[PDB]
């Protein structure tokens, strides 16, 4: 609406600082994930032999059957949390259907 935008233009610069705050939070989330997880410099690989003195490590090491290289316990934790897709894969394309 053009008239609402013209009347909103008189209220100053609230929206630029709201956008600045939201962009700062969005950068901070990626900084959090990068600080927690990327603590290693090289991607180490486990050897093809799987003997570690009798310790199994089979439910925490990945298996190549899944298209996403995740362990068993990681699959349980990802199935446990009822996490929405949150409009990720082209939400306007998803909303254009006849439902």
């Amino acid at each position: 609406s053009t008239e609402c935008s013209n009347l909103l233009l008189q209220y100053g610069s609230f929206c630029t600082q709201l956008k600045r705050a939201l962009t700062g939070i969005a950068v901070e989330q990626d900084k959090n994930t990068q600080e927690v997880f990327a603590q290693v410099k090289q991607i180490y690989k486990t050897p093809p032999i799987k003997y570690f003195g009798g310790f199994n490590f089979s439910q925490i090491l990945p298996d190549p059957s899944k298209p996403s290289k995740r362990s068993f316990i990681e699959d349980l934790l990802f199935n446990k949390v009822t996490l929405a897709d949150a409009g990720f894969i082209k939400q306007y394309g998803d909303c254009l259907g006849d439902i």
């Binding site: 956008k19 962009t23 409009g87 990720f88 894969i89 082209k90 939400q91 306007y92 909303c95 006849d98």
Partner: protein, 369 residues
Amino acid sequence: TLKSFTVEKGIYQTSNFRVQPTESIVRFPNITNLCPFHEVFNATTFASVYAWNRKRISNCVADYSVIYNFAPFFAFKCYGVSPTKLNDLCFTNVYADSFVIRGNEVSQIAPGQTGNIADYNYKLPDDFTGCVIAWNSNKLDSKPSGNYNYLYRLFRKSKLKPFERDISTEIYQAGNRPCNGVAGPNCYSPLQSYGFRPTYGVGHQPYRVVVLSFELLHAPATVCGPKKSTNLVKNKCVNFNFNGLTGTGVLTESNKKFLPFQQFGRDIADTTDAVRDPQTLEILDITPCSFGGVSVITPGTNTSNQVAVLYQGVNCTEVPVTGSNVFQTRAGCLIGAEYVNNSYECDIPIGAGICASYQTQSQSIIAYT
């Protein structure tokens, strides 16, 4: 958008894009009747404030510019709607009232007002919408011997609810002795006659009041003005005017099984998610046109002058509202950056696993994982 003339290397959100409407369609029901507002605003004698009439007005092509040529009033006082805007919008049911009051109690015909007329004669609802028309009538309703043809009530046991009438004539019990239809001590008639004369002041002169009340509800509209309809279009970004639903969206055929009485289709999304045509009887969908954010990917102006544009939430099959390398990311779709089958460190982060960098090998802006 940065209020600066040198920009550093990164990704910046500049503005948003939208798809403009193409056409404008008006859908009004097929009515041809002209209804006599002249029969209300011009009559020999009007009703009283305790016996005001009510005229039902429905299925009418209403032109509200002819009222100014029928009565000489000061102001076309309308509360919830503009007087001059009445041609465009339209409602379902129209009512007309008429009564004659004096000059002292003209202001009491208003929502949330207290007085003799507002309590015992005629009460308006608090959420009233419509138009109230009042003008002086000392040249018609005054006599040199006294105009006693108009009656108003002053004694009652309770206050009137909004939009009510009372024509009962019983002697009020102001004391303990029963009147039994005989006036006397503590026995006064409820109908006090008006004493209208043309020799009085400006405050005691009679006034003619005609009230139009508009019934805005969810029923299908019957009274709409002389505005031409337009043929239907589908699967396009178009401005629609279905009943009073002025809005922008894309019209598709719907599957929502409407009940035979239902007209609107507001889901938890609200904002009239579905709508019914008044011309034909077919359900239709409402969805807004394509929009999203624009992010500009560039290195610094000290280095180069090339940019890349990212549209978020769009797969570039609907993109228009270098310039030839189109890449489909997951965070949207990428314009102006080539894709390579390599892997480096992240220089400018775009989205889910995709980064961008300014590459020496002819210079270009490259995108990778």
